Specification:
This protein has a four-stranded antiparallel sheet. It has 475 residues and is mainly alpha-helical. The protein has helices at 11-16, 32-35, 39-44, 48-65, 74-83, 89-92, 116-124, 126-130, 160-174, 190-204, 211-227, 235-243, 245-250, 269-291, 305-314, 318-324, 332-342, 350-357, 361-368, 373-376, 393-400, 403-411, 426-432, 436-446, 452-456, 466-471, and strands spanning 106-109, 134-139, 146-147, 181-184. The chain has two domains: 1-344, no CATH class; 349-475, Serine Threonine Protein Phosphatase 5, Tetratricopeptide repeat (Alpha Horseshoe), CATH 1.25.40.20. The protein binds cytidine-5'-monophosphate. Cytidine-5'-monophosphate is lined by residues 28, 41, 44-45, 48, 233-237, 261-262.
Length: 475
């Protein structure tokens, strides 16, 4: 009959998220290993982490307090952006909370942040074609990019599927992690396009029956919002680190912990659902490990006590302290829902996931038990979450520093000479990460093979050998 129906039931997970680890929902997982977790990110824009946390937290409390049913608005979007640059020096001179009129905003996209299906959808966005957006190969310059070609100029819609395949091939040819292709955003009707996207989300979310259907609508609109670059800066933080998390928590889902949230431009809506599910899974893993008092080692990062104390002294968010102390009900329904949501994650590439998340030698032996050669040496293809693309389970075992997985992969006679889309082998990675035991274990194998010299001399896309990297360990 009469009940308390929380606006964002998923706040249970934001309260459950360990305080000392909260920075993980803003600091891309890709940085952790080499930038001492949150340190690199913070130094780049001092106070941006506290402003990002406070933005999400205050705006969530505002929606939770409301008597009205949650709906997206141009006003909520402006409020998020305003808060995301509150004390940030690098955002104060870029009008926080105000939309662009004619200003130019541009960036480059590497093949590693793109997909064929994603480029197809990107070229299909009518607002981009009519709003005068520019995209194509070129050169970065002092006053924006110099386009050699602009695909939006005289664009044939029938050509878009073949153009996408060609664009990806060109981006690939240049280099997986290198930038050749640039995007110059729309310089008119940004206010009008922002309103159309909002009206479209509110319309479509009403006719999405299942969580999976709802997730596709959410990501399709977050993507359109990111692609239409409405603000001078902070669009990633505004749309993906903040905005995205509200409809997620509205559905009783945990917020997202991304490895790489910079895929909201040239990835497809369907591909992004998988990306977001991986990010929700990361949040659940962080929560579960901290609950088990298990030290978190995800994405190659072992936090020191010095790093941990530095973050708590730094942390300043009255809204987060409020969420932390909220009254929290049987979470069984919420757990079943998120487990049902993440059950799909399993099926696709289990060995690559095992190299990232697994650490029990017994669980690893069992996972690798009965896997054929083609499975143990499988390189994931374009369209999957960025971390997998062109990589073998061995590549990810080395990068993650997963000794138990690497040991089992060696026992399974995995091809350690395979190159990823960056021309790097497991040995190039062992050098870069400076792990002597991993490199020693790889070399013992390489030297037992006949093509040892050829293997050791493998050059990556920078024409560097694994040993060029080893010799450079420590800048
Ligand atoms: N201080 C910051 C702020 C943003 N970033 C990068 O920018 C992304 C978000 O882009 P915005 O600047 O559009 O918010 C982050 O996911 C991260 O890759 C960073 O590396 N350090």
């Amino acid at each position: 009959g009469v009940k308390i129906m929380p606006n964002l039931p998923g706040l249970y997970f934001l309260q459950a998220y360990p305080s000392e680890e909260i920075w993980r929902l803003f600091v891309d997982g890709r940085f952790w290993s080499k930038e001492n977790g949150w340190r690199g990110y913070e130094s780049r824009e001092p106070g941006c982490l506290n402003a990002a946390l406070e933005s999400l937290c205050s705006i969530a409390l505002q929606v939770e307090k409301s008597g009205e049913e949650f709906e997206l608005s141009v006003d909520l979007i402006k409020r998020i952006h305003k808060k995301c640059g509150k004390k940030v020096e690098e955002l104060q001179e870029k009008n926080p909370g105000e939309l662009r009129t004619d200003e130019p905003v541009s960036f480059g996209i590497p093949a590693g942040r793109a997909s064929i299906k994603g480029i197809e959808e990107f070229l299909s966005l009518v607002f981009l074609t009519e709003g005068g957006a520019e995209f194509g190969p070129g050169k970065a310059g002092p006053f924006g990019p110099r386009f050699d070609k602009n695909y939006f100029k005289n664009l044939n819609p029938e050509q878009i599927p073949d153009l996408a395949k060609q664009i990806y091939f060109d981006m690939c040819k240049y280099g997986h992690s290198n930038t050749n292709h640039f995007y110059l955003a729309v310089m008119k009707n940004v206010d009008v396009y922002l309103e159309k996207i909002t009206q479209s989300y509110n319309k479509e979310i009403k006719t999405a029956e299942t969580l999976d259907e709802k997730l596709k609508i959410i990501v399709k609109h977050i993507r359109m919002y990111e692609v239409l670059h409405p603000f001078r800066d902070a669009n990633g933080r505004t749309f993906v680190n903040n905005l995205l998390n509200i409809p997620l928590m509205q559905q009783g889902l945990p917020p997202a912990t991304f490895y790489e949230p910079n895929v909201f431009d040239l990835y497809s809506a369907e591909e992004l659902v998988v990306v977001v599910k991986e990010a929700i899974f990361n949040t659940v893993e962080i929560i579960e490990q901290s609950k088990r008092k298990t030290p978190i080692t995800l994405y190659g990062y072992h936090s020191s006590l010095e790093e941990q104390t530095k973050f708590r002294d730094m942390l300043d968010s009255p809204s987060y302290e409020k969420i932390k102390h909220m009254d929290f009900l049987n979470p069984e329904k919420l757990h079943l829902k998120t487990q049902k949501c993440l059950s799909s994650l399993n099926e696709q590439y289990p060995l690559h996931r095992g190299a990232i998340y697994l650490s029990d030698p017994g669980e690893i032996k069992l996972l690798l038990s009965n896997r054929n050669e083609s499975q143990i040496n499988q390189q994931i293809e374009q369209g999957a979450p960025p971390i997998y693309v062109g990589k073998t389970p061995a590549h990810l075992a080395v990068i993650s520093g997963n000794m138990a997985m690497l040991d089992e992969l060696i026992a399974k006679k995995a091809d350690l000479s395979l190159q990823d889309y960056d021309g790097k082998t497991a040995l190039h990675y062992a050098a870069e990460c400076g792990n002597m035991q991993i490199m020693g274990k790889i070399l013992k194998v390489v030297l037992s093979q006949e093509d040892a010299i050829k293997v050791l001399n493998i050059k990556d896309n920078h024409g560097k050998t694994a040993f060029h990297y080893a010799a450079e360990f420590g800048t």
